[PDB]
Design a protein around this ligand. Structure first.
Ligand SMILES: O=C(Nc1cncc2c1CCCC2)[C@@H]1CNS(=O)(=O)c2ccc(Cl)cc21
Ligand SMILES: O=C(Nc1cncc2c1CCCC2)[C@@H]1CNS(=O)(=O)c2ccc(Cl)cc21
Ligand SMILES: [Cl-]
Lengths: 305, 305
């Protein structure tokens, strides 16, 4: 029993964190095999950030301008290349702690663990979701750039995010491990803003199924809804539209609890109208949207209470 | 910016998790140097749990009755002894991954990270607090016994909890690494219940300081209070009494934000008497009490390990 915001064990990622320095700029790098991946803005000064010409800044650099530190050992850079917004530094030593891994680009609503790091040293781990507006609500200070997001389903680490910047509202933007930004963001200091954010509907439904699995049904009602009527109501509360894909994905949780997806949608419609009336659901007074259907199945018992 | 429920990086603890089997009972063990620590109830059958005599159950066991598996390698048990509610299995191999460590007993209100494990394999990491009623609100299923709680100080892991059982309300109970329970619990199948819990006042105040640091100030007011008047009000809401030690501990956060501790106590009094009025603090509609003053300082400073 219980339901917590649970991160994957971070050990496999801790053994890949290194410090990358170019001149006065220092940030984190991810060392996999003989390559260190880091944000390309490590070659920028603060002044360069308004309109940096990365190709022009990079051509003026040699391999020995990049200092890579793994623990107390200095790695030797023997090559470099830029791929989108990431810099790939070829080093003379393959990481002996390289886990089994993949690079995966995720979609909004997907969750992942973040290993926050400073000076190549891990400080903490927490669970995040890629918001519908392509930002993440992380906890990052200056020096956290290059910290990564990942999942570890089975023994393979799927790297899905690398931290690049903090927007004016205090939310965060970054790239996949191929250097492609999530969202319409650029690694430039020009005026940029997070778009209006919305609630991840499929995740709220998954978490309501987690509450039923753990023994709570107070929020259920005798009604059902059509998918279109549900979406007309949901969008009035700034909730993402629920698609047939989301309904299909909730199938297993619907079978385990015996509650049809559109019947759970009717409960959600009522919760949006009434609020909780002094009650909580899984220790929360707000509707939680950072647990996916897959996260609920992973954390909850297969036997409903 | 940002504020997340953050756990310590778990790698140093992952390298200590093993699987312990005695007959039909399988659970997790902690392998440090040449000793494997695990709940002594691993020697019990379901019937034995009703009224166990652990010395009598243990005397009937030989070293080869305990199967210890570290990854895909079988460890050889060469000795065994009991210390309070913990079984210490001496093995023929010292753990090459043993980190620098200490066994520490924590007090209610203190937080720690939990590495949930099943079959000696880590599945997730989350942060929690030792409640005033000595339970923890964890997330554990069958097979999680032997999972451990810890804090990291510089490079030293301080092990503070080992999981033993779930109470009827779905909350959890366990021991320190010397086998002494937290709370008035016993390791047997008998009528046991979590006592009435209270809110950790010093932690709520720490989290209100974190909200101010992160730019949430709507709850601040011009008023102050005495420590005695604050405690008279706090007692009415099932909040733990605030002591002069708690006021002293909040000193640094008070200096950083410019808000006296008793000034923040007056904001907390108003929040208890009037609610949030449709507002949230750090994305929560409830007053959060599972962040200590030290957790707030650490997360808002980027301390690494
Ligand atoms: O956003 C940035 N850093 C950063 C990342 N995470 C957390 C925090 C910070 C800054 C202080 C607050 C906490 C930088 C610098 N600021 S910037 O506007 O020059 C900028 C712009 C683009 C890129 Cl790719 C990067 C950046
Ligand atoms: O509590 C216990 N295990 C356990 C731990 N974490 C999570 C979960 C469980 C059981 C299934 C549900 C989820 C056991 C069995 N139950 S018991 O009451 O027989 C018991 C009693 C004492 C001791 Cl030390 C242990 C136990
Ligand atoms: Cl995805």
């Amino acid at each position: 029993s219980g339901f917590r915001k649970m991160a994957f064990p971070s050990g496999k990622v801790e053994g890949c964190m290194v410090q990358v320095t170019c001149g006065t700029t220092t940030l984190n790098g991810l060392w996999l095999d003989d390559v260190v991946y880091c944000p390309r803005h490590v070659i920028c000064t603060s002044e360069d950030m308004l309109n940096p010409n990365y190709e022009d800044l990079l051509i003026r650099k040699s391999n020995h301008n990049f200092l890579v530190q793994a623990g107390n050992v200095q790695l030797r850079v023997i090559g470099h290349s830029m791929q989108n917004c990431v810099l790939k530094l070829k080093v003379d030593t393959a990481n002996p702690k390289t886990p089994k891994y993949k690079f995966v680009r995720i979609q909004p609503g997907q969750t992942f663990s973040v290993l926050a790091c400073y000076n190549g040293s891990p400080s903490g781990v927490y669970q995040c979701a890629m918001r519908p507006n392509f930002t993440i609500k992380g906890s990052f200070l200056n020096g956290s750039c290059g910290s990564v997001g990942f999942n570890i389903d089975y023994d393979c680490v799927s790297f899905c995010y690398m931290h690049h910047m903090e927007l004016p509202t205090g939310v965060h933007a970054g790239t996949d491990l191929e250097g492609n930004f999530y969202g319409p963001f650029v690694d430039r200091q020009t005026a940029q803003a997070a778009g209006t954010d919305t609630t991840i509907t499929v995740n709220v439904l998954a978490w309501l199924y987690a509450a039923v699995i753990n023994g709570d049904r107070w929020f259920l009602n005798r009604f059902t809804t059509t998918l279109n009527d549900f979406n007309l109501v949901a969008m009035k509360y700034n909730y993402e539209p629920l698609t047939q894909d989301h309904v299909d994905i909730l199938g297993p949780l619907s079978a385990q609890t015996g509650i049809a997806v559109l019947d759970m949608c009717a409960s959600l419609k009522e919760l949006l109208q009434n609020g909780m009336n002094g009650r909580t659901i899984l220790g929360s007074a707000l509707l939680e949207d950072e647990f996916t259907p897959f996260d609920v199945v992973r954390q909850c018992s297969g036997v409903t209470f």
